[PDB]
Symmetry: D2
Subunit: 305 residues, 4 copies
Amino acid sequence: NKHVNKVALIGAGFVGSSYAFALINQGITDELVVIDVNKEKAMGDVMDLNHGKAFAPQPVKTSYGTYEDCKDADIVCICAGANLELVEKNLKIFKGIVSEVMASGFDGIFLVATNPVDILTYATWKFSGLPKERVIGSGTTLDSARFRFMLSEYFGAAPQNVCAHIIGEHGDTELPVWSHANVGGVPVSELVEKNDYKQEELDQIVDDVKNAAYHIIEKKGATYYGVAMSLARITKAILHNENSILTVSTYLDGQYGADDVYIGVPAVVNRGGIAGITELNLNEKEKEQFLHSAGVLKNILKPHF
Amino acid sequence: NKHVNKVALIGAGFVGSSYAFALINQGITDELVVIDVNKEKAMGDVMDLNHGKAFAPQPVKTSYGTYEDCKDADIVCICAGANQKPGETRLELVEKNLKIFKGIVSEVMASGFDGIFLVATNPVDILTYATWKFSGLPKERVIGSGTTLDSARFRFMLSEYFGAAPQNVCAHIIGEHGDTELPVWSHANVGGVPVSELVEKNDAYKQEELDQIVDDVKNAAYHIIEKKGATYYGVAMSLARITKAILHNENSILTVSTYLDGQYGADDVYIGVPAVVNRGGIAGITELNLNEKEKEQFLHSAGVLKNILKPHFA
Amino acid sequence: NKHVNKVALIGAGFVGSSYAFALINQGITDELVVIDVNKEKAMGDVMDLNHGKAFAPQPVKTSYGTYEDCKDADIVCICAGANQKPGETRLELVEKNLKIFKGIVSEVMASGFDGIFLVATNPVDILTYATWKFSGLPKERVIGSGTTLDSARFRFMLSEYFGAAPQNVCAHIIGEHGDTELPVWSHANVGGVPVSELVEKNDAYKQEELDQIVDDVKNAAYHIIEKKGATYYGVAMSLARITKAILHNENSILTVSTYLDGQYGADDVYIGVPAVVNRGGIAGITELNLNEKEKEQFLHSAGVLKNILKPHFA
Amino acid sequence: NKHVNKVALIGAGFVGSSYAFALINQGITDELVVIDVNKEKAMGDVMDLNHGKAFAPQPVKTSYGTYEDCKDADIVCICAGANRLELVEKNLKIFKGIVSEVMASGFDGIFLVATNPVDILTYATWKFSGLPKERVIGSGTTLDSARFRFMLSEYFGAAPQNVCAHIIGEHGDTELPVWSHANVGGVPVSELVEKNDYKQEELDQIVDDVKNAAYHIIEKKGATYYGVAMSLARITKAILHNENSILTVSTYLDGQYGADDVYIGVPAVVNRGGIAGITELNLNEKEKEQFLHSAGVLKNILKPHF
């Protein structure tokens, strides 16, 4: 009796629906159940998603469901919420959601997508009582993948042999780890000096990354395709025991001079969830940029915990 | 053009965007250009689709453009048009969409485009025929989604009934994409065993059970629409499937909208039949030997389409 | 094994090693154990296969072991045995291989193995039947490669004759893996159109051309052997294909060696017929309605096998 | 008219046959032609390889052929040659005949060289053919580096994709690990070595297994071919699919690592044009000397013949 991979999705808005469409197009899970307070929408979405079932690369059973259907889920992905005020609404929404999920007997991994992601990931860990290695937030995985790709273009190599992370809070206080950005083994700073590859050229790439989402929202009011893709990517590392290094929202206790906070850092991800935290030796600018970011978060945290 | 595939999408609504997302998720094309006069929404979608490109299985260049950017496209897929309003007849919808298609197709042809058209807009068989007339291209290079979605579904469900892989099952829905489409029970077979035989010799396999599979296939869109307001994920997948068969020269048999001049006793009409699809478009038409009931149903289905074409084309 | 697929290969000759290489190149299994008393050659092959593991699409753990290492195997594939020497009859070869299989199967069963057997050693239908008797397993869990290779090559060539994808072509070779195997022309079809109809409706499609597709399929091994001394790449691929259908629960229809107790009018014999293959092994048997000529050919083919079984099994 | 990818294989021994079986199993090329002095063996292999054609993941047309059939090949892969510094001697001759016959067909693609000693015969092929140095490529130390890389993602517990480590220099005893730039997720190996106790001579023994892997295989069954075939198919894949993958293939240097006028193993970017750029690692003092000593060994063996 071989293991059946099962994902439970909570919140069938634009992010959730797209996330589902992505799992189906990539053949990532064996089963998917969709849960939303708006029964009719989730129902319609499931039907639409199954309409083209025959064309999916791999069989995937997709169904409408309720909180109790989370019992044997490997992953519960939360895309629900509202779109200091907002943090209040969502903090409560999550409380009821995690409560209902845990009440079903779910004993898997939480994947949190709704913003502010670092905050709601910390919250989910609290409300659920699960080990911190099994509550995971999307963190800055999207921004880091982008940064990483733009650089394989810029320096002309495959993304596979290019290294670059974005860490910190998923937000304006997130930061690039220039000190460890390397191409094929060769540090970026090295390539910048030996050629005239110029500095604020690379600095502009970081500028685009941080504002990418705002610009999308400015034009169509919401962002969902890129988000959905990052979620499917993280779900893939888990379900297929990849040990992939991803800058997901992770609980720190001393690793980067930070403790008691969920924040974006490169973490090894596998079927168990977080399997280790990659500890980069930050230089001086990075070290304070980071702690400033961790401080901003922990500060919004205490009023609620 | 030589080492790289390019798709131009015209119309970035729910169908078009989902199609785009499907192409990117499955790794079907190297380049996609999105064309739509609604600039904010379309550039937004393009930026959103590019935001997460690093996660896709293959590199995919997505951009916002206009007709001039079709010059080197392998495929132009058209999802643009109006949707028919309640109380409006199909001939009334067709009058509006023909005018839209006239502008789109002439602008596309004037860009230098020399590829294949893939038509998705309803009524798809009608607009495929129009695109052929408007473009002056060979009939093999103008393709509509036809009954591909209903067939594939019909075929998966039978696979998920008689208990065998989709790949090993034969079941076609043919005719117009709409209420007169028909199942080809006479040629439906599992592993090569006719469905009528399977029914006859196992009473776990009942007729009405099978007919019910047909009832549901034909009403699936309407029910999705009831609960969600519209339907687009299935359409998008069927379009991605056809695009893949073209770009990768698969020679897959699909019930796309296809021009008939005599086959099945129908003339001068685009309509859903099993056709071989490859990099050149339509490579061949499968001519099933329809039984007497099927033949009558099919000629009625072709007639329903010709009643709509007649007032618009000589 | 819960999240992990494991294959045990018994016999690391040219067939077994190529099979191993195919599994690794296609990403079919998570683990492979190779079992062969010829230690130097087999550990050599194992080390060689591990040498380039980094380049394989998926991580594959390959090791050298013995019967005890079959305990948690999903599949045990047996390629070991002697090969027919010139002047030796098949009954004489079978006497030697039954003795070999008796030891192999009893040791495998005593390891705690509770998976599926995949048999490749010649004459495969005979040794599949023996493996069933020796193992005491359900007949659904003992599978031989049957006529899978000849069928696939019968079905690709037709696809490469009528101009369509293999996926939409239906053609089976059934019967013993050997000179009495037969084509099922009566159910051979393209997109659902009977071969006999395609023939008589187009004079570019001719009988003799089709028949020689058959004579060539049946003589393919002999010609490869003439030129290179042995045949093993095709066999290896057919085995990898069957293994994939099993490990990934495909429900693919394949003409594997299958136990019949009445179907097609044959009893108590393993023989090549279209069967549904999934994670549990044989999920179902496709019963094609053979015409009178085919029925006679098939019962003769089953008879040839029973003439070999009879002196060895009650 | 979409481009048709075409590979011509010269030498259908164990390496070539396996290399072919790999291309077919991975769906890497659209067409493959097989060429060998032993016509009947090449004919047999092609037949065996097509026997199971219906099961290949992607369509691939495989056929028997001759030097003339190289005309429109994207890639000519040479696995022919004899299997005692006279080995270089016999092979240098074989290659001369082969390249001459290939160029004489109008071939204007990329050469992929696998026959040992690969660095030397890659240099030779460049000479005999007259092609730009970016279009003659040897397998170099790609296999050894791939192993080293995987054998470290396990050790440190991450995915190979998030691990960095090269083996450079001549394909042989004088090849060397680039410890100074070996990193995991961005974190250099040295940092992890003393910060946890990951032991030094442990990571060390890994470099020893790599270098002797092939000898040990040969000790047991007489030749290596599966691993070689896999590395060849991987390089063929980077080329035909314009990957821009960084591989330590045999590459022509002119000053890049204190070395000039020599084919040797270094990380190079590989795409449809062939070598697209040479990755320049800041070698430390130890590595710098190991490397030049390796280039010297090679350049020394070249002189007598050029």
